[model samples]
Target: AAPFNGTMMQYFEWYLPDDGTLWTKVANEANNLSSLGITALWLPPAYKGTSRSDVGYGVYDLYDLGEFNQKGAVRTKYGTKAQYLQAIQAAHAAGMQVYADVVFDHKGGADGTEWVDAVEVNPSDRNQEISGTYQIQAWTKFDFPGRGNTYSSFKWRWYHFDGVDWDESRKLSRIYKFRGIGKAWDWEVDTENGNYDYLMYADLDMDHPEVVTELKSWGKWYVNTTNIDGFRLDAVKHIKFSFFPDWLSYVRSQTGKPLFTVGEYWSYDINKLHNYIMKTNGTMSLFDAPLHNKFYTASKSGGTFDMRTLMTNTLMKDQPTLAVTFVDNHDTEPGQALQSWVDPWFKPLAYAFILTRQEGYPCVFYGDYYGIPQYNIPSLKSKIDPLLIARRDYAYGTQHDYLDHSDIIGWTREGVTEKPGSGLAALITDGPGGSKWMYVGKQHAGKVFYDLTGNRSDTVTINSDGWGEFKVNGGSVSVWVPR
Candidate 1:
């Protein structure tokens, strides 16, 4: 089997056109994207949400992938269910892996309400209950009427959830824990608010046997229906940390195919991420949130930041095998929830660090590549194309790091014999421009190299000792390859 080399792309950003052509657009661009060295595509949620415009996150019906006439339309913001399948088919045809964004954390737009015993708790401090157990109307009952009993006859009730955020009687929003025979928040979740089990609308009780069985059943149905290569699990930090081991195991066993699953456990704390990985037995990869924060900090720090300490507290620096590194995503984009947009000037440098390095599964953002027309954001495709090309063609062999300087740091890839002229050197500086003496391998001795980033036009010749003094522009990155 070939080594799992190559990058993935998060195919959508915060804001998208409501024209209902995104699926078709992706289908049309799948071949072009594959040629650009995108080996995998992480698609957004495809199910029907609370409304036609709900961006597929409010997850109304799991079975309705823009198929049913529910949610005020027979299609989602992207398009119809047929279009989604077509996009996946096109992606596969282009020799690319498709990873579906799975949103199982909470459900919205229930058909009706059910009366249940519950106690209101402080939203800020979930551990503190403010009201006694009383009858409250909860929107926990789910009965899909539009696609009535098509896929499965399972009906959800209040017992299926552990908590909710509202009470119909009071018309108030508070964390209401269901008071049943033996009800408690799902165990082994993030320690936020004492316990981070209750995130949003109708928190699915992973401990419930019925819920687990149904979720597992849905997983099998989804994989068989879509024929996807893997999944990008949403809001995993709020879900029971231990629930995934058995769930992923069951899904993989049932699918009988290699499934790549990455979870979104958004946190800058590398220790928390590492603990989660060990707790889950390392069955899935996690987004490198700490590395992203480092990028964010550098982008905000006007050249005064130390470039040498970029990877000091990042997940990729410690656990490369289970790290999915990225610059920006739907959440981190300009104006959405969890907004932490990286400075445009520093994005190329950040991309170079991930794409050209021999660590972490690098992911390109759709917003950065295609440009958000609605937000007047320019596309970075021209600037990023060469870096992608370098990763695919020239980025290989033993890497030698020169992370000694605070203002300037770089690494050189000693090209492997399998790829002729594959050796290259990279130099980056957050302060004044300078040169770094790095070795690119003795095979390229006396050879002349030029900048691939086009930041610098000057060429450097490798000495007899295979060392070249590579120069980079101030506050920028320069990549050198044999001319």
Candidate 2:
């Protein structure tokens, strides 16, 4: 949080390669992605699925049983389970960590073939509450007694009920209504069967103690199997918040470490998120949807959102462990536009804030490492970029010395607590890069430095006032250290 903890891992999917042997190509990417301040690699579902298809989420087997055998070497087009473990090792060896996606919420298409993370929900046992179910509708209605604040309504889309569904396996529709929704929003149930449930994208029954047990078991088995630093929980927005304490506590209990779990709290409203931070008991963190999405909007598509104000107030002011910051992800709600994380014009500045800020875990997206949004995409990458240089110089070290005003305009951060060259002060700007002024090498006194952008180094001979007055590029950023 304030101490500049954690890292942002890019989503490494299977489509990047054709052979499906993760070691065949994935290890290559993992090898190069170690830089850019990310301590871990957040990979896609490495488990075997229904077949050799690109639907990475449609899992079939958790143990690497091939759904199509050859099409999917390890039950998925990604590669064999051996390859998955090898990829994890590859990242670890590269000084980076790895986290495999978990879908204990539900299973794949056919009961045993492949649906969710290699786990199957037998039809006969669907009615019986297992880790998963036959369909979300099989269970009784979730008591949404006091639900009122309607962001996610219960969406039960199925053939029998909603006419058509995404998966044609069960005739039943996916169930929303994770109970207690009616008290949160001002809305009406469907005229059809008055369908009211959790918003239906394979909603996990988090309320069930047994389901929570299974999730904890999955966490224990997952970490023990692959051994990653943390989890980038998808569908986190839809999961029940009421059970967060118990669920996270159970997970940490099994995983040995404090289990860094980041949930998708899609809303960034400071008013709403100010309180959401405390819900996790510090065990779970959340994606900084506000800053990331807002940055995309303000930068890519020419939208407007106060990046400085949000980071300054919510992230720094609110509980630190509550947020995980990044520009964009795979979700299409924001889509591929100038506002996407791939935008070239705004990326440099995005990195600047991430490097300087002491708020939530700073996570650079796909392009940061291999330069995603490259080619016709938002290809913004510079090997000599100061963000990379500075971060590389002090990636794993502890940062100290925080100074900010009441209005939250000026602040300073040092990489290490002791020694002379561990400090830098940056004033937020009103323009693009949001950089106003930079004071480097405080303890070294008046020392000379080079401007990365201007590519010119100058000695600090003292200005008319007293300070060195090192004016950095307005839209661009400059990171300086001792001579």
Candidate 3:
């Protein structure tokens, strides 16, 4: 099979209404998204959360994918399990793969509370115990009465978790570490806040043999049940760095399929990302957060940002094969915990960079495509569609970087023999308008090229030297392709 360049789209935004119709929407719009050059769809968590409105991060039951009537509603924020399956089928029929969002870092809304021996710890530094060990009411028991061992007979107790943030007895919300033999934060996690393992709710004890066995079983069951093409693993930095490799290998071995997995490490440090990639043995891809940080910084730089430094210290530049480049996501949207929405004006330029570049696997965000209605963010589909088309049709072959200018930069992809008329020259300017002389290829010496982004009306003819001066408007991007 010929290797075709593919793009992935995050199928849901943070502010999507809890109407229990997202799955139906996915089923209906699969063809539309596929037509937009999206080869893979990353759907939100299908499992039941604390409630129908829960965003699936606060997972209540991993087995209950809106199938059981336990989380106040039979259907999750997306929809029922049947609808979710149909959506996946629709995506598959439309020639697109589906990636399920998997959250295994913690469990929320437990079935019952238990009086466990716990000690209050400093919220800033979880390694320091602020109070002596005492019995605190912790919500650690998870019977999953709604599931009733339908998938597995595993039941969770206080020992299965390392800590909780809430104490029901004192009615106080404080970080409390459960006191038990061999009970401590996972040493392999990020060192931020003394230990970043305990993020929220009941943090899972990954070191526990039973927990690992259960999670592996769950991984097997999840793949067999949904038949998803891959997984978008949630909160990898909080979990042990060496966890997913074993789990994923076991699952893949049992299923006999190479599942594409990407982890959300959620760090702007490229070294940390590199460490995680190394620790995981490069078994999965990671989101290019440092690149997103650069995008966000450039967007808010007010034309002062240097375009030459855009790709510096990014996973897309250092570890291209394992980098899933994205501009924004649910966590980066407005009013979210990690809110850092890229400026509106620079969004197209950012998309142009990610989509046209040959370094990493680019992922278009749902908010950027569909817009956040709650925040009155207008849809960027019109601006992004042309770039998507350019990526699908014109962006191919060996890449040439002309990232010399400080304010304006450009790159070109020499068209390959396999794909006729696929070469393109992309110019981006974060400041005043300018042009850059870039080489597309000597093969296209006299070919005429026009701006595929529709930002420029004039056309350029490649000289005998195979170089053309690509122009861009002030603080804008123009993708030049064969006329």
TM-score of each: 0.98, 0.69, 0.98
- The lDDT, on a scale of 0 to 1, for candidate 1 is 0.90
Looking at model 1, the pairs that clash are none
Off by more than 4 A, model 1:
1-4
Whole-model lDDT, candidate 2? 0.47
| lDDT per residue (tens digit) for residues 264-316 in model 3 | 99898999988888888999999999999999999999999988999999999
Worst 10 residues of 3 by lDDT: 1-10
Worst 10 residues of 1 by lDDT: 1-10
Best by lDDT: 3
Is 2 or 3 the stronger prediction by lDDT?
A: 3
Evaluation by lDDT, superior candidate among 1 and 3: 3
Assess the local accuracy of residue 295 in candidate 2 as a C-alpha lDDT between 0 and 100: 56
> What are the runs in model 3 whose C-alpha is more than 4 Å off?
1-3
State the lDDT of candidate 2 residue by residue for 1-483, as single tens digits: 223335656654222444665544657776566654457766777665545664466543444423224332434666666766677777788787665565543434333112321122222322222344233323222222222222223322121111112333554443222222222211121112222223333334454445565456656776776677767665444445456667667666777766667665556566545555554455667666666654565464442444344354445346655666665565521343223443555566566666656666666655444443333343345622466545544332333332332111343443465333444443333244322343333443554444433322443332333234544444344544445
Tell how far residue 479 is off in model 3, in angstroms: 0.4
